[PDB]
Amino acid sequence: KEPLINYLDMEYFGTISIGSPPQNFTVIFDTGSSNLWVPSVYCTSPACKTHSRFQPSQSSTYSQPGQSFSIQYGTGSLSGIIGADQVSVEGLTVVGQQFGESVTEPGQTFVDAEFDGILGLGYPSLAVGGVTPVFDNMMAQNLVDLPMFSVYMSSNPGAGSELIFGGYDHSHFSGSLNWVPVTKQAYWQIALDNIQVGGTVMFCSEGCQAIVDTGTSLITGPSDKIKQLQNAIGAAPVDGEYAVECANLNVMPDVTFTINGVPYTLSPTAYTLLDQFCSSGFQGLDIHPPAGPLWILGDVFIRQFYSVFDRGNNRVGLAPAV
């Protein structure tokens, strides 16, 4: 199986440290999950050999709570034991933070993944084993001035891309922030009024649920609706992805997501990946009930709209990125 297949595509990465002395790891900040885990030095899979692996014995501040763990991202389980130690995230250091030390097969493709682990930023209800998420510890340990964090994902050249704990940077967005209430506290789940193409409602006419997920590269939705969306914008099937003729970019329709009565429009320039060819920034992904079905506003959306995640008021702030 490929437990992390949904994270193997274009992502943004950051660095964190665990233990004393610090052991560095490249991780993905994922608002679509809530656990922090990194490869264990005890993972002897060929796929783990190319990554930084946590070595408990080299850290004087490490301790074992006693519980083991197992997480699921929808395509296979990842298991190991839970550890506790100091975790540092540029400027801040959380003491006693618990995280997973994965041991089981992570998947052959993980061998070339550009990241080592994942740092979930979702709600604790999504955390497996009732392990307190990093951001919840930050709040509980009064490390942040405001109970929120925000993400800026740069489309060019992603040099200036940054994650901010404790607030947001108004230099990354124009106008005032539009707030959206979190409908279900697990993922950063919100409600869509409707989705329209070419200025005409075409999906979720009666509203549907979605989540703002930094861990998801594209904008996803029920596979069937996406197909309808693919040919509506002019995308065509290929080897396994949907391509679009770069030329007809200016003749393609706008895709608008109406959230809390506000229109969030994506021009074909915004929902098309230049990764010499042009492909679709939309993809099918069926989340099983009771959690799904869901639409996922991934990086493709966040690049167009600076996002603010506020645990203090349980809401999401959106505004045009700069």
């Binding site: 995230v89 540029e90 490390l143 891309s161 994650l163 901010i164 404790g166």
Partner: peptide, 9 residues
């Protein structure tokens, strides 16, 4: 008020 920035690439 301080902002704790985490660069992403």
């Amino acid at each position: 008020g301080s902002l704790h920035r985490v660069p992403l690439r």
